[PDB]
Amino acid sequence: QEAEYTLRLHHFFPASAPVHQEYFLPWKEAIEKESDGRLAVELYPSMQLGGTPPSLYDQAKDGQVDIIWTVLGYNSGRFPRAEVFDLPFLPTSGAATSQAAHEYAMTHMQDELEGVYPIAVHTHSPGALHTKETRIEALEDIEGLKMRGPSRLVNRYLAKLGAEPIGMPVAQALEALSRGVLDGTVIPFEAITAMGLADITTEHTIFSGDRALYTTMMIVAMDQDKYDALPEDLQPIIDAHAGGREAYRIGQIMDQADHRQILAIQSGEQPGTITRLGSEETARWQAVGQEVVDEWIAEAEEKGLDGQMLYDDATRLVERYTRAAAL
């Protein structure tokens, strides 16, 4: 059939992005086929419909476009309950942490996400430590390093570890590293390569055990008004391709992409070194992490949020979905 509704999906990443190739393309297919063509989905990567990434959330909410994919934290401070997912050593895999974020958001973020229909609230694959020169084999080795963290809480963690955290827009990264304003940065492996950093930051440190350094919360968000305008027999087609199992899948795609990057470095296909810290060393980093958690909880309480309850629920959910997947 001819399209009754055309859903324009807008995001910042290139069409070659794993999520675009492996999630949005099949999402588009399923929506179109299951609606018998009544729903068309048009994909616009690389900000091809205009603006910059901090404007995406409002582009969907305001109905300029129908669906967006974005980082909540691009509007820093806008989603204060979501920030719990930025804490050090909270996440496990992108897949399981994603499923946990979705459920957390459905429980706690109904007002924070008012006006969007959440196709998937998820996280990216957990990040790692990337430096030009310093092989980080112990906590002591990060002391004094100029490191760009990708969130407030990761920068706070960096400062507790004794690094000097430096805030700047993401586009300034490659160049601040090359200019020597920065020693390194904290981001996933897929982001290192896509940013043109794979030959600049050739030392990479990851950790032992069933928790990883950090992630942040992302969303595939539809204008609630557009969802509400769809007929009763088409809304369920969207519902069938929305929710926590979609979030899991997005996270898993991002996990697979980061794993391929690690394999490439380990094989020699890409240059550099991957250092994994042992268990006991990793515990020292987690102990510092716990200080950031405790500070976040206190600050949240001071502002009227039940921070302890939220942290406890985020961590409960991460454990739930990690265990379910391991089985």
Ligand SMILES: [Mg+2]
């Ligand atoms: Mg709206």
